Design a protein around this ligand. Structure first.
Ligand SMILES: Cc1cc(C(N)=O)c(C(F)(F)F)o1
Length: 209
């Protein structure tokens, strides 16, 4: 059972701007997703400070980067707080409508796409490099769900029958044909060192056979 939803008009317009604007500095997508993972890990850590059972779904707080050249996917896994079904539908837990408004005033005033994370909609920078994004997520208070969108104005949500996750979020980037540099070990290492040196969780770059 798959539910199909329309993006709010303002979010559809943000996505088309990210997809259509000429902008060479695409590597910031990884910084933005790692920062989102760090924020989610901070949230479950804070909740666990007064309720240790919040970590019964997994004590380890980490971020994994998993490239797969055969599937042409880059997967970013964290064991943060995750999102409920309602969170997924409501723009993956963001205030994306007001964030898009502020972001787009900034660009018309001199900002560039790399400051997208200052407006709370950094997730959508994934479409700088991905033709399709799948988000698998599990929050302590809900079941495991899969969100998916190839932009074009709609997203789907379904119960996930795949490998159970325990708790956290997995962002699967189905990369564009000309963006496969983000599957190469040395390129990912360079980006992580450049933009994510002060993330307070272990970031593990998986290698391939
Ligand atoms: C906005 C937001 C939060 C998270 C998360 N829970 O880690 C994500 C992700 F994963 F889709 F990129 O986006």
């Amino acid at each position: 059972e798959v539910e199909t939803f329309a993006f709010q008009a303002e979010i559809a317009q943000l996505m088309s701007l990210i997809i259509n604007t000429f902008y060479s500095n695409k590597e910031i997508f990884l910084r933005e997703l790692i920062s989102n993972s760090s924020d989610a890990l901070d949230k479950i850590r804070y909740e666990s400070l007064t309720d240790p059972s919040k970590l019964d779904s997994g004590k380890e707080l980490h971020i994994n980067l998993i490239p797969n050249k055969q599937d042409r996917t880059l997967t970013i896994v964290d064991t943060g707080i995750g999102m409920t079904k309602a969170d997924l539908i409501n723009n993956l837990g963001t205030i994306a409508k007001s964030g898009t408004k502020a972001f787009m005033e900034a660009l018309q005033a001199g900002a560039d796409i790399s400051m997208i994370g200052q407006f709370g909609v950094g997730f959508y920078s994934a479409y700088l490099v991905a033709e399709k994004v799948t988000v698998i997520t599990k929050h302590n208070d809900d079941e495991q769900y899969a969100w998916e969108s190839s932009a074009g104005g709609s997203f789907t949500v379904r119960t996930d029958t795949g490998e159970p996750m325990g708790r956290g979020t997995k962002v699967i980037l189905h990369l564009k044909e000309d963006q496969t540099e983000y599957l190469e070990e040395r390129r990912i290492k360079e980006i992580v060192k450049k933009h994510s040196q002060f993330i307070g969780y272990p970031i593990t770059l998986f290698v391939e056979k």
